[PDB]
């Protein structure tokens, strides 16, 4: 009765196009009369190692950009670069443009990813922005320009554009202004991330979800102060819990009658002992990519 | 592990969702060409639901009793019929967003995307696996019936599931788009029991192939087995027996890795009989059974 759920992707599918420079093809986002895509589309082989993007860009003309919306080519009539994103002005407005905004998400927030190849949507799944500003996605060659988003009412909030895969197999990208999340650079180099930590407010949300669906073997009669919980959390590379996090979990504490700090005491015990080979909502590991909102919406 | 439960993009299905109301009962329907498909229990009074007389309830109905809306725009109903547990409402407008589509009946172990909808409005999309006992582990609230499950092959939407009910154990049951239930369930507000569930062997094998493709291959042994010997062992561990179709849908992964299906079965047999002994596969001591062979090839390649 509790599932990792992506937003319906139709409003975003109608914006995906294919963008090609030379031998490099990736995806773009077509909103009104502008197509947004990762700037490294303008790179060749030799370029990707250490590209001077302003240099590469000035040597380009509008006609070197091949933009295809399905079996239809769009004419590029202007281009500009904003940080690591290229903006291609085309002569046709996308009639399928939804109401939208560009947002920069905070670590610990979640969003849906519409993975695309050759301008064609291929799959949708939920991701969290990690505390170390990576995301644990599923992206292959040609996925760059795939976007992450949330939907509030009629409005699509774009928060992520995909650019790279790190050697550990996690992923890195930018907001739609082209600024990376995290200390990464769009060059073909092996980059390591900062130490990742676990999103504690999300683990607590998920534990509450497991209680709602009747799995409460992990609960206990003990309790803890906020600070004492945070000392243990930090020891185990969990993010500290703020009073705003406690407030945000209110609805779930109300719903289940379990005080936030009582659930913290359960989590502390799990951190110190393990799951004894047991499972919670099917998982052998503590899940930290469900926000309190994600849980509430769905229960 | 490197693997995500990934749904299909839902847009082609979003363009087909409507709502269908009888009296105060509203659920979701599927609008393809000039027909709307929905669960027949929309015609139930909350008091008719203990053991509804669907044929009698339908006889009293006329086209003008059904309120079909795409958003808030009414779609006029011009004909109605019942096919097993689904109602078919002929409407006077062909859906301009109708995709290329088919109606397919899936087998246990197969996965599909669910577009969870309320009042004809999509709320979320997620991947489900049909369990061997013909339940799915969904996330459905009141008003979700008529939500559909589907796969997309190139441009074509294969609709395989329509949602009708929840079981006491928290799992979910429903029909294909011809209204035939998966499993032994019926659309009555009664407590019904799923058979004990079992592990989807073919998908575990796909998972082991996935592990091999990614270089995690400690569990490969030097032996093989017959299919019958493997199946008799597997049942003692509450694993499903393999069918010939299971062996065939493992073909591509077998060819990609050069590991014969029956050799992988012998490796799985040893894992069942000996446990993992503290080891992991794809970063987990638990074997995953909700990725099909198609799903593995989707994400790896
Ligand atoms: C999209 O163009 C593509 C998406 C990745 C391909 C594999 N999975 C992906 O997420 N992006 C890239 O290939 C990156 C292009 C750069 C930004 C110009 N490059 C990238 O991710 O390279 C791999 C980094 S790890 C590495 C690099 C060098 C040597 C060893 C390891």
Describe, in plain words, how this protein is organized in 3D:
The structure is a homodimer. With 299 residues, chain A is an alpha+beta fold. Among the domains of chain A are: 10-90, Trypsin-like serine proteases (Thrombin, subunit H), CATH 2.40.10.10; 200-298, main proteinase (3clpro) structure, domain 3 (Orthogonal Bundle), CATH 1.10.1840.10. Chain A has helices at residues 10-13, 45-48, 53-58, 200-212, 226-235, 243-248, 250-256, 260-273, 292-297, and strands spanning 16-21, 24-31, 34-38, 66-69, 72-74, 76-82, 85-90, 99-102, 110-117, 120-128, 147-152, 155-165, 171-174. A 7-stranded antiparallel β-sheet of chain A has the order 5-4-1-2-3-7-6, with no helix packed on it. In chain A, strands 8, 9, 10, 11, 12 and 13 form a 6-stranded mixed β-sheet that branches. Chain A is elongated. At the A-B interface, helix 1 and strand 10 of A face helix 1 and strand 10 of B. The structure holds ligand UV2. Residues 26, 40, 43, 48, 139-141, 143-144, 163-167, 171, 186-190 of chain A line the site of ligand UV2. Chain B: Residues 1-301 are cytoplasmic.
SSE map:
The structure is a homodimer.
Chain A: H1 10-13, E1 16-21, E2 24-31, E3 34-38, H2 45-48, H3 53-58, E4 66-69, E5 72-74, E6 76-82, E7 85-90, E8 99-102, E9 110-117, E10 120-128, E11 147-152, E12 155-165, E13 171-174, H4 200-212, H5 226-235, H6 243-248, H7 250-256, H8 260-273, H9 292-297
Parallel strand pairs in A: 8-12
Antiparallel strand pairs in A: 1-2, 1-4, 2-3, 3-7, 4-5, 6-7, 9-10, 9-11, 11-12, 12-13
Helix pairs in contact in A: 4-7, 4-8, 5-8
Residues 26, 40, 43, 48, 139-141, 143-144, 163-167, 171, 186-190 of chain A line the site of the ligand *[C@@H](O)[C@H](C[C@@H]1CCNC1=O)NC(=O)[C@H](CC(C)C)NC(=O)OCCSc1ccccc1.
């Amino acid at each position: 009765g509790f599932r990792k759920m992506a937003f319906p992707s139709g409003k975003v599918e109608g914006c995906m196009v294919q963008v090609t420079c030379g031998t490099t093809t990736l995806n773009g986002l077509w909103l009104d009369d502008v197509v947004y895509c990762p700037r490294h589309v303008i790179c060749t082989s030799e370029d990707m190692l250490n590209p001077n993007y302003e240099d590469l860009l000035i040597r380009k003309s509008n006609h070197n950009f091949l933009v295809q919306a399905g079996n239809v080519q769009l004419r590029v009539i202007g281009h500009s670069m904003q940080n690591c994103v290229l903006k291609l002005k085309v002569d046709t407005a996308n009639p399928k443009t939804p109401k939208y905004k560009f947002v920069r998400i905070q670590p610990g927030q979640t969003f849906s990813v519409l993975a695309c190849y050759n301008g064609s949507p291929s799959g949708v799944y939920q991701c969290a922005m990690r505390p170390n500003f990576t995301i644990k996605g599923s992206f292959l060659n040609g996925s760059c320009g795939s976007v992450g988003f949330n939907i509030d009412y009629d409005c699509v909030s774009f928060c992520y554009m995909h650019h790279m895969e790190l050697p550990t197999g996690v992923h890195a990208g930018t907001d739609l202004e082209g600024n990376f999340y995290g200390p990464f650079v769009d060059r073909q180099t092996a980059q390591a991330a900062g130490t990742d930590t676990t999103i504690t407010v999300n683990v607590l949300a998920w534990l509450y979800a497991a209680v709602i669906n009747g799995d409460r073997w992990f609960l206990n009669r003990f309790t803890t102060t906020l600070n004492d919980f945070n000392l243990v959390a930090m020891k185990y590379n969990y993010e500290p819990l703020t009073q705003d996090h406690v407030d945000i979990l209110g609805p779930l504490s109300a719903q289940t009658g379990i005080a936030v700090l009582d659930m913290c005491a359960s989590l502390k015990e799990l951190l110190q002992n393990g799951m004894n080979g047991r499972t919670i909502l099917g998982s052998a590991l503590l899940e930290d990519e469900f926000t309190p909102f994600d849980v509430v919406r769905q229960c």
